[PDB]
């Protein structure tokens, strides 16, 4: 059912409203996703000036429905089965020895485009830390997103660790706690334990004058 909205290239739209340690900001993004390949290409722009935090801290926040689930795992794809009505995605993202983000998002189709609309609140960030200190390198590592079914909420939970490369050669962990809930009341797939294996490359648009990020990502379900 929901899965058939993803047999081809789908336009994507991202919108975020944020507040980190009281600094407010906005971001708009556009691109396309092709779940056949688990492939995503997105470009984001800070519509409110300079970004208060490093672009990479926001990658996970800015569409797991574009994950490639292999044939033998199609029945474990909660993300697509909740479409077109979509889901709510909430996270606590805790940065080791520093602040946290709490985020809330709706992911759903609006006409022929997949839209991800987010609210983010950050607190307790050290003014001289890796985040507000802008000490993260402009790149992104490759991770496993571990998914589990949450029958009580008719959805799923995920847990994972993002490794942010720090300019001084160290690594800043960001622990991700995640909950997804369908928006429609119809049937959804509740999957067995599995994970998503992700790889992301960050780059810049040479002709872009605004503060921005270009993201290329590949996501593939595995573990069954």
């Amino acid at each position: 059912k929901g899965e058939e909205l993803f047999t081809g290239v789908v336009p994507i739209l991202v919108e975020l409203d944020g507040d980190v340690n009281g600094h407010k900001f906005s971001v708009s993004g556009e691109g396309e996703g092709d779940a056949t390949y688990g492939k995503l290409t997105l470009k984001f722009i800070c519509t409110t000036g300079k970004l208060p935090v490093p672009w990479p801290t926001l990658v996970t926040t800015f569409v797991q429905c574009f994950s490639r689930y292999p044939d033998h795992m199609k029945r474990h794809d909660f993300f697509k089965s909740a479409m077109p009505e979509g889901y709510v995605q909430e996270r606590t993202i805790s940065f080791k020895d520093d602040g946290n983000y709490k985020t809330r998002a709706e992911v759903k189709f609006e006409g022929d485009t997949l839209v991800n609309r987010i609210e983010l609140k950050g607190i307790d960030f050290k003014e001289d830390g890796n985040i507000l200190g802008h000490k993260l390198e402009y790149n992104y590592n490759s991770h496993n997103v571990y998914i589990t079914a949450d029958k009580q909420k008719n959805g799923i939970k995920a847990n994972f660790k993002i490794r942010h490369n720090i300019e001084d050669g160290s690594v800043q962990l960001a622990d991700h706690y995640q909950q997804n809930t369908p928006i429609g009341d119809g049937p959804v797939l509740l999957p067995d334990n599995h994970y998503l294996s992700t790889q992301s490359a960050l780059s810049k648009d040479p002709n872009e004058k605004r503060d921005h990020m270009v993201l290329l990502e590949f996501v593939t379900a595995a573990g069954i």
Epitope: E137, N139, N165, E167, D168, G169, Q199, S200
Partner: nanobody, 114 residues
């Protein structure tokens, strides 16, 4: 064409010293930060050490501070991990790491401290 290859792993007695090498191909070691991780069986793969791209800063995880030194020879495009005061707790497969568009790992080298 980006490749990393670790070497140097071996059996070593506690207290001993050992040096690991990470040979890099496909990119210049002096244009990218590089890192060592390790993974003991059972446990998760933890970050061990790193050096900035410019070379001006090095960092370590608390449990190896003052015992390990990371360095690099730019000309040989190689990164090293000098280990001293080896503890049996240091037993693990060691990996080096770089991000060049995407993240790359070497295949790892086994260090056994017994």
């Amino acid at each position: 064409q980006v490749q990393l290859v670790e070497s140097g792993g071996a059996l070593v007695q506690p207290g001993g010293s050992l040096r690991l090498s990470c040979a890099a191909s496909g990119f210049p070691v002096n244009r990218y930060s590089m890192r060592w991780y390790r993974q003991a069986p059972g446990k998760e793969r933890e970050w061990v050490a790193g050096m900035s791209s410019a070379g001006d800063r090095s960092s370590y995880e608390d449990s190896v501070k003052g015992r390990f030194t990371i360095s690099r020879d730019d000309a040989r495009n190689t990164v090293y991990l000098q280990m001293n005061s080896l503890k049996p707790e240091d037993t693990a497969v060691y990996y080096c790491n770089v991000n060049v568009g995407f993240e790359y790992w070497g295949q790892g080298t086994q260090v056994t401290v017994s």
